[PDB]
Design a protein around this nucleic acid. Structure first.
Ligand SMILES: [Mg+2]
Ligand SMILES: [Zn+2]
Ligand SMILES: [Zn+2]
Ligand SMILES: [Zn+2]
Lengths: 84, 178, 97, 557, 107, 171, 268, 112
DNA sequence: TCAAGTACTTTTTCCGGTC
RNA sequence: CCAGGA
DNA sequence: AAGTACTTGA
C-alpha cells in the first residue's frame, strides 16, 4: 500500500545487501554510459565511481523495502546511514 | 509494449463473452458508464460532440506548444491553415490520423466559440441521457424529434417528442453562423 | 562445470541474489518464450518478424507477454503438459498476503 | 542470440496448476496426429503430415517451423493432439479417481453424505482443500447407499428427503490399472454371500464424474475452472512437440528417435486397432482386450515404474523411459537441470599452496585466464585499454577473444579478417581475458558451508595449478594431496559487486557458525611462530633488516 | 470441569457439548497429581483477550495462519482451557536476550 | 462518441538517459508510442491531453539489465467507432461497388447495395459518381452514414455502413 | 534435509524471521535480533561471587565515611559526602544491580558467567585507557549524575526494534534485557571510577562506542538465516566420529522425530 | 513449549558431545521450525515437505512428480515467494540482494 | 472394533574406459 | 554400468 | 531401514 515517510519504521541504516546492490546497480549503469553525478577524480572503474557517488550521497536511487504483508517503505540512498 | 487502462478485471482462464457493441447503449467494457480516473475516484464516461472535441485537442496542442518553447529556453478555412500550422509545431507529423481528425472536426463542428459549446453542454446535460446520446445530439443536426429518435435510436422512450423537439430548436439557435 | 544444489545453497546463504540468477540463466540455460495472458501457457504462435502474436483457442491476438526462463523449465513445463498437467504462468498476482 | 520481440516483458508472479480439459487439448493443438510413422513421406526423407510435424515443431536445423516461422533456437515446439478411441485413466490419478468413486454415488453422481450428517458438515467445514477431501473420504467410503430420505435436523421420526436414488454402492478395489466393484446386494435380506462382481468401465466412471455437482466436487479437492474431476480421465491426449522428444540424428540417412516418439507410436497403433475394431464387426472381447492395451500404453508413457510389474520394456530388454522418470530426483529436471545446472565461465584444476599470495587472492594459471572471459562495455574510461587487448588478441596474455557489436553479431578475434583494424564504438562489448584483481568465485566441493565458496582477487601466474593462501585452507577444507577446486567468473558489474561486497575472503574471516574466526595461522607459520617467540630467540641486525623489509607496510622505522 | 478417577463412559461423554454457550471439560485425576506448569521446561503462557489478539495481529501485520500454533489438546492449552482461535503469549528466558516473548494460537 | 480516456503505458528507459532531461524524454517517447496509435480496445489514440501534468512515477530498475521501467499514467482523446452509430463524413473514393466516407481518423465504406435502389453508378463522369433521380454523390459530397459494422485492422478500424434507411444519405 | 527444510527462512524488514508463507518462525532473529559474527563470549560479573564480594565491588554509600568514593577517585569527592539527593541515585543504581543479579541467576541456573553477547565492553575500556592515556593517579572529572544518567540514557539508544507502540516497544525492551545487565555491571559508578579510572571524555567516548558497536551488531534484513542455520549444523555433523546413542545416528533419530528410539532414558 | 526446550537440549548435546560449538540461534531456528506447527514436524519427506509451501518448492525434494500431479488435480496456486520457485523460474529471488526493489527518483536526479 | 499383517514408498557429497 | 580421484 | 497408508482377522 506504501507506508508514509512519517510512519516509516525500518532501520535508518543501509543494509549490507542494499549497499552491495546500490554499488552493483550504479556501477552497471555507469558502465552502460549513464550520467555520473560526481567529479571523477581520475577514476575509470565504474565500481570505484559508484563508491565515490555513494561516498558523497549523490546517487539518485531509492530502496523500496517490502514488508511480509506486501506494503513498503521507500528510503533514499541520500537518507540512509552508511556505517558498513 | 501497448497501453493499459484503469479497468483491472481478472479474466482467469474464462475467455469470452465479448457481447457485441451496438447503440442499444452497449459499448465496450472500456466505454462503460462507470469509469475510474488515475486518482481512483469513480468518474462518469467523457463523450465529446465534434466541436467540444475540436476545442479540447486545439487547447491541448496550444498548451503543449507553450511547454515546448519553455523547455527550449535553456473563419474555418482560416482555422484549417491555423491548425495545420500548430500540428507542424507539436505533433509527430507521422501522426496523419490527428491531421485528418482536426480537418474533419474543423469542417463538421456545429459550434465555433467556447461560449457556444458551454450552453450546448448545459442544455443537454440536464436530460439525464447517457453521454453517448448527449454527444450524438450535439454532433448530429436534427429537425423532427423523429429525425433524432431514428438516428439516435437509444433515445426512443428516454425523452418526450415535444421535450426533445424543444431542445432541437434551442440547439439550432446556438449553431454558429459559419 | 556443475553449479549444483549445494553451491545454490551457499549463494542463497551469502544473499547473492543477482550472482545466482546469472549462474542459472546467463551463464547456462536461459531462454525466451511467449506466453498467453488468458491461459498462462506457452501456446503463443510468435511470428516475431511480421509482428504477429496469436494464441488460437484463446482467439487472443492482443494479451501476450514475453518471459526469460531457463530452457529446462520451458522443457519441464512442456513435459508436465504432455502428462495432462497445466502449469499456467501468470505475470500478475490475485492473492495478496 | 534470440531476436527482438515487441511483446511486453514480464516476470512469472504466479503458477496456476490445473488439468487439461479435452477441449483445451484440441484448441491448443496445431495438428492431429493420426499416423505412427515418424516421417519419410513413403520413404522420401522429410516429416510426415501425420506424426512429428503434421504442422508441429521442426527438424533439419535448416528448414523453418511450419506453424510459427522462426525455427530451432527460438521456436519452442508446438503441441498436437490424438483423439483416443475410448477414455483411459491418467496413471497418476488412478487412486484419486478410486477415492472420488468411493465418495460419490456410482449412479446419480451425488455425495454419499451431506449437510444432514453432523460429522460431514464438520469435515465439510475444513478450510484446507486437501484435509477436507481427506476427511470427506474416510466418512463417505463406509457409506454403501445413496439415501433418498435421512432424519431431519431435529427429529429422527419424520425423515426429510435429500437427493433421490436408492442404489447400492460397490466396494471398489484396484486390479492394476482397472477398478472393480463388489455390490453388497439384498436377495432374501442376506446376499452377499456371493455379490455382483463387475469391473467399472472408464466411460461409466467418466459419466458419474460429469454429473458430480460443482458445489459437491468443489467440496472435494477440485476446482470448476482449472481441475474438474472429469479431467483425470483422458479422451484427447496431448502430443508433445519434437523439442521434448528430439531424435539423435547420427550420420545423414539414419533416424535415432526418442523413447517418447516410440511410446507414442505404440499408443497410436493401440488406438487404431481399437478404433477399427469397434467401428467394424465388434467381437466385444477383442475390444476390451485392445482397450486394456491402450490403457497400458497411455499409462506406461507417463509412468513406466508401476506396482503391477510389466515394465513396458523396449525391444532390447531396456525399459522405456517414462515422463515421470525424467523429472524424478537428482539427475533429471527439477533437481539435476533446474536446482543445479552445468555452467559456462567455470574452470577446474589441482590446487597447491603459496606463502607469497595474499589471503584474498587466487593464483590462476595463464591458460585458464586466457580461456575465461569478462564482457566489458566500451566506454570513454576503458576505450583505449580495451582497444589494446583487442589488438593483443586471443593468444597474448592480457588480450581478448570476442567483440560484441550493438547489431548483436559476435566478432571472433581468432578468425576475423578485421581482427587487426577493429575500431571499437561506445556500448560495444569486448570479451576480454580474466585479469589480475578481477573478483572470482572459488569453491571446494562438497560445499556444506557459505565459506566453501568465497570471492578471491585474480592473480594470473604460470604453472597448471590454482594457488591459494595457506590460511584460507580450513574454510574450503582443502589440502594439496591431489585436491581440485572450482572457479566461477561473474559476467556483470552487478555480479562482481555481489562477490566483492558480500563474499570476499576478508569478510568471511569471523564466521557466524560459531561466532569466531574460521581462518587462522597454520603449519609452518604456526610451528615457526612458537620457535620465533621464545625468550631464548634473538636476531642479529643483518636478518632483522630482511625480516623488516619483508613486511609490506613497514613504517621504515 | 469434571475430575474423574478412571473413566467416563461414551454414553456420558456424548452429553459434553450438549448445553452451549456453557462449556464442559474432563480431567483424569491421575494427570493432575502433578502440576506440569511447575516444570523447569514449562514457561509462562498467558491467554490474550479479543482486543489483545486483534492488536498482536495489527502490530505484526499478521493473518491467524502466520502465527505459531498451540495444539488444542496441548497439556498447557488444556490447563488454561484455551478455545480454538484463542492466543497465548509465551515468556521464556533467553541465553541470548534474557527474556523472549513468543505467541501461539489455539488449534 | 469521441471519448476522453485515462490510460497508462510502461516505458523501458536505457541508463544513458538517466540525466536531467529524463522526464522530457519520457514524455516524448510516450507521445511517439501512443499518439497516432490505433487499438481495438480503445480505438484511435489521437491526442494526449495535459502534457504539463503527465505522471511519470518512480521507475523500477530492471535487475540483470541496467534500464528503469516506469508506468507513465496519462489521459487522451480517443475515437472508437461502433455499429449503430450514425456519422457524418466526406466521400473519398467511389466505384462500381460503392463509396468510402472519411469520418475523422477512419474510412466507412457504403456498398452499392447498402444504398437505395434509385441511386445508381455512373462511370461516365469525372470523377465517377452515384446518381439518384434528385441526388448526385461524388468525391467531394457530404454524407450521413449508419455504421453497420467494424473490423479492427492493425493500425486502423474500417467499417461498412448504409444510407438506405430514413434520414440518411446526402446532406 | 536441513537445507531443504530451512531454505525459505530469512529476516524481514520487521526483524521477524519468516518463511515463504510469511509465517513467523522466530519473532526476532535468534531471540536477540543480533548477527552471530558480531557476538563474543563475555563475562557477566554481577552473576557470581559472594554477596559480600559483590557489595565491595558495586556499593557506593555517600552517607557513610568508609563506603563513600575517596576524593582521590573523583574531584567532587569532598563535596559529595552526605548528599541525600545524590544518594537516592546510587540507591537506584545498586538496587538495579541487585535486581539484575537475581534475574541472571534465574536465567543461567548453574551460575555460568561467560556468555556470547554483542559489543566487547572490556576492549572498549582498554582502548579508552590507551586512547586517552588514563592517569591511574589523578582524580576523575566525572559527576555521579554523569555516570548514573549517562548509562541510563545510552540504554534507550540500543535499538533493535523501531515501531512506536506498546507491543513493539515492550519487544525492544525484551531483546535488549541481557545486554543491559552486562552493560550496567561493567558501567556501575564504583567500577568506572575505582577500577577503570575513566575521565569524563574517556567515558563519553566509551558510551558512544558501545552505541555504535551495538547498532552495527544487529542482523541485516535480507539475511538468509535459514540456509545459514542448516549449514551451521550440517557442516559440523560432517566431522563426526551411562552409554546412550549419540553423534551422527542420534542426530538421525532427532531429525526424523524417530518414534522407536534406541536408548530411551529418564533422569530422575 | 517444553517439547522445544527438550528438542534443543538434545540437538545441542549431539554437537557438544563431539566437542564442537554451533551458536545457539542456528539450533534454536531448527528447533523452532520443527515446533511452530504445534507438534513435532520432522526434517523428512513426511514432515516439512508436506506443509502449505508452494508445489514447485516442495517438488524440489523427495516427492517431485506426485507433488506436481496433486498440484494439478487440486488447482494449487504458487505464490512464487520461495527461493526454489525463482531458481526454477530463472528470476532474482527475494533473497538478501533481492529482498527489496531499486528505483530512480527524477526529483533527486534533477537535484544533482 | 483393534492389533498385526500387507503393499509400496524412499534416500545415499563433488570430479575416465569400453559398451 | 565398470574402474578410479578429494 | 524406516516409515505412511491401507487391509485383515479376533
Ligand atoms: Mg585432500
Ligand atoms: Zn491462451
Ligand atoms: Zn514453431
Ligand atoms: Zn444416487
Amino acid at each position: 500500500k506504501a507506508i508514509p515517510k512519517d510512519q516509516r519504521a525500518t532501520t535508518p541504516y543501509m543494509t549490507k545487501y542494499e549497499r552491495a546492490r546500490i554499488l552493483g546497480t550504479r556501477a552497471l549503469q555507469i558502465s552502460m554510459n549513464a550520467p555520473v553525478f560526481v567529479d571523477l577524480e581520475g577514476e575509470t572503474d565504474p565500481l570505484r565511481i559508484a563508491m565515490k557517488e555513494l561516498a558523497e550521497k549523490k546517487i539518485p536511487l531509492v530502496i523500496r523495502r517490502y514488508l511480509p504483508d506486501g506494503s513498503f517503505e521507500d528510503w533514499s540512498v541520500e537518507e540512509l546511514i552508511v556505517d558498513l | 509494449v501497448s497501453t493499459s487502462t484503469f479497468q483491472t478485471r481478472r479474466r482467469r482462464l474464462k475467455k469470452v463473452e465479448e457481447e457485441e457493441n451496438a447503440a442499444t447503449l452497449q459499448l465496450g467494457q472500456e466505454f462503460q458508464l462507470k469509469q475510474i480516473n488515475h486518482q481512483g475516484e469513480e468518474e462518469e464516461l467523457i463523450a465529446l460532440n465534434l466541436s467540444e472535441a475540436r476545442l479540447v485537442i486545439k487547447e491541448a496542442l496550444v498548451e503543449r506548444r507553450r511547454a515546448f518553447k519553455r523547455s527550449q529556453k535553456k473563419t474555418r478555412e482560416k482555422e484549417l491553415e491555423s491548425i495545420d500550422v500548430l500540428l507542424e509545431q507539436t505533433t509527430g507529423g507521422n501522426n496523419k490520423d490527428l491531421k485528418n481528425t482536426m480537418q474533419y472536426l474543423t469542417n463538421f463542428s456545429r459550434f465555433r466559440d467556447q461560449e457556444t459549446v458551454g450552453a450546448v453542454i448545459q442544455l443537454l446535460k440536464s436530460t439525464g441521457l447517457h453521454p453517448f446520446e448527449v454527444a450524438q445530439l450535439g454532433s448530429l443536426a436534427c429537425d423532427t424529434a423523429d429525425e433524432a429518435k431514428t438516428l439516435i435510436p437509444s433515445l426512443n422512450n428516454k425523452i418526450s417528442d415535444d421535450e426533445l423537439e424543444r431542445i432541437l430548436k434551442e440547439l439550432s439557435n446556438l449553431e454558429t453562423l459559419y | 562445470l556443475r553449479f549444483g544444489e549445494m553451491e545454490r545453497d551457499c549463494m542463497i546463504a551469502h544473499g547473492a541474489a543477482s550472482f545466482l540468477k546469472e549462474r542459472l540463466m546467463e551463464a547456462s540455460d536461459a531462454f525466451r518464450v511467449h506466453i498467453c495472458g488468458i491461459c498462462g501457457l506457452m501456446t503463443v504462435i510468435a511470428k516475431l518478424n511480421h509482428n504477429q502474436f496469436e494464441c488460437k483457442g484463446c482467439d487472443n491476438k492482443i494479451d501476450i507477454y514475453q518471459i526469460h526462463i531457463p530452457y529446462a523449465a520451458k522443457l519441464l513445463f512442456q513435459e508436465l503438459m504432455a502428462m495432462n498437467i497445466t502449469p499456467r504462468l501468470y505475470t500478475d498476482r490475485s492473492r495478496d498476503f | 542470440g534470440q531476436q527482438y520481440s515487441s511483446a511486453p516483458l514480464r516476470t512469472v508472479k504466479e503458477v496456476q496448476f490445473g488439468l487439461f480439459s479435452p477441449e483445451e487439448v484440441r484448441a491448443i493443438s496445431v495438428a492431429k496426429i493420426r499416423f505412427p510413422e515418424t516421417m519419410d513421406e513413403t520413404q522420401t526423407r522429410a516429416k510426415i503430415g501425420g506424426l512429428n510435424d503434421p504442422r508441429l515443431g521442426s527438424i533439419d536445423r535448416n528448414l523453418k517451423c511450419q506453424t510459427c516461422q522462426e525455427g530451432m533456437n527460438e521456436c519452442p515446439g508446438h503441441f498436437g493432439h490424438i483423439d483416443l478411441a475410448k477414455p483411459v485413466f491418467h496413471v497418476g490419478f488412478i487412486a484419486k479417481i478410486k477415492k472420488v468413486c468411493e465418495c460419490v454415488c456410482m449412479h446419480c453422481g451425488k455425495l454419499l453424505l451431506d449437510e444432514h450428517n453432523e460429522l460431514m458438515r464438520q469435515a465439510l467445514a475444513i478450510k484446507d482443500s486437501k484435509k477436507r477431501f481427506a476427511a470427506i473420504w474416510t466418512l463417505c467410503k463406509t457409506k454403501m447407499v445413496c439415501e433418498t430420505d435421512v432424519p431431519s435436523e431435529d427429529d429422527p421420526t419424520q425423515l426429510v428427503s435429500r437427493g433421490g436414488c436408492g442404489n447400492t454402492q460397490p466396494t471398489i478395489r484396484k486390479d492394476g490399472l482397472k477398478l472393480v466393484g463388489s455390490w453388497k446386494k439384498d436377495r432374501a435380506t442376506g446376499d452377499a454371500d456371493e455379490p455382483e462382481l463387475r469391473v467399472l468401465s472408464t466411460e461409466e466412471i467418466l459419466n458419474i464424474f460429469k454429473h458430480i455437482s460443482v458445489k459437491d466436487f468443489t467440496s472435494l479437492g477440485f476446482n470448476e475452472v482449472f481441475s474438474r474431476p472429469e479431467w483425470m480421465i483422458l479422451t484427447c491426449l496431448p502430443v508433445p512437440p519434437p523439442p521434448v522428444r528430439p531424435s539423435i540424428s547420427f550420420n545423414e540417412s539414419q533416424r535415432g528417435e526418442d523413447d517418447l516418439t516410440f511410446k507414442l507410436a505404440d499408443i497410436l497403433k493401440a488406438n487404431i486397432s481399437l478404433e477399427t475394431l469397434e467401428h467394424n464387426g465388434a467381437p466385444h472381447h477383442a475390444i476390451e482386450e485392445a482397450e486394456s492395451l491402450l490403457q497400458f500404453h497411455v499409462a506406461t508413457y507417463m509412468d513406466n515404474d508401476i506396482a503391477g510389474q510389466p515394465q513396458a520394456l523396449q525391444k532390447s530388454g531396456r525399459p522405456v523411459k517414462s515422463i515421470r522418470a525424467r523429472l524424478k530426483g537428482k539427475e533429471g529436471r527439477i533437481r539435476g537441470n533446474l536446482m543445479g545446472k552445468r555452467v559456462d565461465f567455470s574452470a577446474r584444476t589441482v590446487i597447491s599452496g603459496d606463502p607469497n599470495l595474499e589471503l584474498d587472492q587466487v593464483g590462476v594459471p595463464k591458460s585458464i585466464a586466457k580461456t575465461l572471459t569478462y564482457p566489458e562495455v566500451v566506454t570513454p574510461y576503458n576505450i583505449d585499454r580495451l582497444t589494446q587487448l583487442v589488438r593483443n588478441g586471443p593468444n597474448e596474455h592480457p588480450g581478448a577473444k570476442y567483440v560484441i557489436r550493438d547489431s548483436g553479431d559476435r566478432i571472433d578475434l581468432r578468425y576475423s579478417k578485421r581482427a587487426g583494424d577493429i575500431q571499437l564504438q561506445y556500448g560495444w562489448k569486448v570479451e576480454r581475458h580474466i585479469m589480475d584483481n578481477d573478483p572470482v568465485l572459488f569453491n571446494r566441493q562438497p560445499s556444506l558451508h557459505k565459506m566453501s565458496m568465497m570471492a578471491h582477487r585474480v592473480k594470473v601466474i604460470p604453472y597448471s595449478t590454482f594457488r591459494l593462501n595457506l590460511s584460507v585452507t580450513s574454510p574450503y577444507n582443502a589440502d594439496f594431496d591431489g585436491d581440485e577446486m572450482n572457479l566461477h567468473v561473474p559476467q556483470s558489474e552487478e555480479t562482481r559487486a555481489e562477490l566483492s561486497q558480500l563474499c570476499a575472503v576478508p569478510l568471511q574471516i569471523v564466521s557466524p557458525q560459531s561466532n569466531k574466526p574460521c581462518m587462522g595461522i597454520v603449519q609452518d607459520t604456526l610451528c615457526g611462530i612458537r620457535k620465533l617467540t621464545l625468550r631464548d630467540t634473538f636476531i642479529e641486525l643483518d636478518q632483522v633488516l630482511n625480516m623488516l623489509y619483508w613486511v609490506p607496510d613497514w613504517d621504515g622505522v | 470441569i469434571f475430575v474423574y478417577q478412571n473413566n467416563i463412559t461414551p454414553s456420558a461423554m456424548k452429553l459434553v457439548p450438549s448445553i452451549p454457550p456453557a462449556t464442559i471439560e474432563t480431567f483424569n485425576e491421575a494427570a493432575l497429581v502433578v502440576n506440569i506448569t511447575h516444570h523447569e521446561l514449562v514457561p509462562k503462557h498467558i491467554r490474550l483477550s479479543s482486543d489483545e489478539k486483534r492488536e498482536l495481529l495489527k502490530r505484526y501485520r499478521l493473518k491467524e495462519s502466520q502465527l505459531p500454533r498451540i495444539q488444542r489438546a496441548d497439556p498447557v492449552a488444556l490447563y488454561l482451557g484455551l478455545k480454538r482461535g484463542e492466543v497465548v503469549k509465551i515468556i521464556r528466558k533467553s541465553e541470548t536476550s534474557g527474556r523472549y516473548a513468543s505467541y501461539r494460537i489455539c488449534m | 462518441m469521441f471519448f476522453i480516456k485515462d490510460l497508462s503505458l510502461n516505458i523501458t528507459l536505457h541508463p544513458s538517459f538517466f540525466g536531467p532531461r529524463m522526464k522530457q524524454y519520457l514524455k516524448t517517447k510516450l507521445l511517439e508510442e501512443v499518439e497516432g496509435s490505433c487499438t481495438g480496445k480503445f480505438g484511435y489514440i489521437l491526442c494526449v491531453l495535459d502534457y504539463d501534468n503527465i505522471d511519470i512515477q518512480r521507475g523500477r530498475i530492471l535487475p540483470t539489465d541496467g534500464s528503469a521501467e516506469f508506468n507513465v499514467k496519462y489521459r487522451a482523446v480517443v475515437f472508437k467507432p461502433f455499429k449503430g452509430e450514425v456519422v457524418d463524413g466526406t466521400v473519398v473514393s467511389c466505384s462500381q461497388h460503392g463509396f468510402e466516407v472519411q469520418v475523422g481518423p477512419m474510412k466507412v465504406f457504403v456498398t452499392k447495395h447498402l444504398m437505395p435502389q434509385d441511386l445508381t453508378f455512373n462511370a461516365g463522369s469525372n470523377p465517377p459518381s452515384y446518381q439518384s433521380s434528385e441526388d448526385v454523390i461524388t468525391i467531394k459530397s457530404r454524407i450521413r452514414v449508419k455504421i453497420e459494422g467494424c473490423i479492427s485492422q492493425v493500425s486502423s478500424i474500417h467499417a461498412i455502413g448504409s444510407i438506405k434507411e430514413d434520414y440518411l444519405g446526402a446532406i | 534435509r536441513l537445507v531443504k527444510a530451512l531454505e525459505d527462512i530469512m529476516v524481514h524488514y520487521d526483524n521477524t524471521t519468516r518463511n515463504s508463507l510469511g509465517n513467523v518462525i522466530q519473532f526476532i532473529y535468534g531471540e536477540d535480533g543480533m548477527d552471530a559474527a558480531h557476538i563474543e563470549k563475555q563475562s557477566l560479573d554481577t552473576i557470581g561471587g559472594s554477596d559480600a564480594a559483590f557489595e565491595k565491588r558495586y556499593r557506593v554509600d555517600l552517607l557513610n565515611t568508609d563506603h563513600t568514593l575517596d576524593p582521590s577517585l573523583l574531584e567532587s569527592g569532598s563535596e559529595i559526602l552526605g548528599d541525600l539527593k545524590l544518594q537516592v541515585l546510587l540507591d537506584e543504581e545498586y538496587k538495579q544491580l541487585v535486581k539484575d543479579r537475581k534475574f541472571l541467576r534465574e536465567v543461567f541456573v548453574d551460575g555460568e558467567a561467560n556468555w556470547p553477547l554483542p559489543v566487547n565492553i572490556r576492549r572498549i575500556i582498554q582502548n579508552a585507557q590507551q586512547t586517552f592515556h588514563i592517569d591511574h593517579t589523578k582524580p576523575s572529572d566525572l559527576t555521579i549524575k554523569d555516570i548514573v544518567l549517562g548509562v541510563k540514557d545510552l540504554q534507550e539508544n540500543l535499538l533493535v526494534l523501531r515501531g512506536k507502540n506498546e507491543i513493539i516497544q515492550n519487544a525492544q525492551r525484551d531483546a535488549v534485557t541481557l545486554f543491559c545487565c552486562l552493560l550496567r555491571s561493567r558501567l556501575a559508578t564504583r567500577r568506572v571510577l575505582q577500577e577503570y579510572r575513566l575521565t569524563k571524555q574517556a567515558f563519553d567516548w566509551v558510551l558512544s562506542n558501545i552505541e555504535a558497536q551495538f547498532l552495527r551488531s544487529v542482523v541485516h534484513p535480507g539475511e538468509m538465516v535459514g540456509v545459514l542455520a542448516a549449514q551451521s549444523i550440517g557442516e559440523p555433523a560432517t566431522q563426526m566420529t551411562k552409554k546412550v546413542t549419540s553423534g551422527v545416528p542420534r542426530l538421525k533419530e532427532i531429525l526424523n522425530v524417530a518414534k522407536n528410539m534406541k536408548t530411551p532414558s529418564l533422569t530422575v | 513449549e517444553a517439547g522445544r526446550a527438550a528438542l534443543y537440549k538434545e540437538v545441542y548435546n549431539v554437537i557438544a558431545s563431539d566437542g564442537s560449538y554451533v551458536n545457539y540461534r542456528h539450533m534454536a531456528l531448527l528447533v523452532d521450525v520443527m515446533t511452530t506447527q504445534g507438534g513435532l514436524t520432522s526434517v523428512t519427506r513426511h514432515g516439512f515437505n508436506r506443509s502449505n509451501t508452494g508445489a514447485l518448492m516442495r517438488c524440489s525434494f523427495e516427492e517431485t512428480v506426485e507433488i506436481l500431479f496433486e498440484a494439478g488435480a487440486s488447482a494449487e496456486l504458487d505464490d512464487c515467494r520461495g527461493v526454489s520457485e525463482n531458481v526454477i523460474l530463472g528470476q532474482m529471488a527475494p533473497i538478501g540482494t533481492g529482498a527489496f526493489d531499486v528505483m530512480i527518483d527524477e526529483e533527486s536526479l534533477v537535484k544533482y
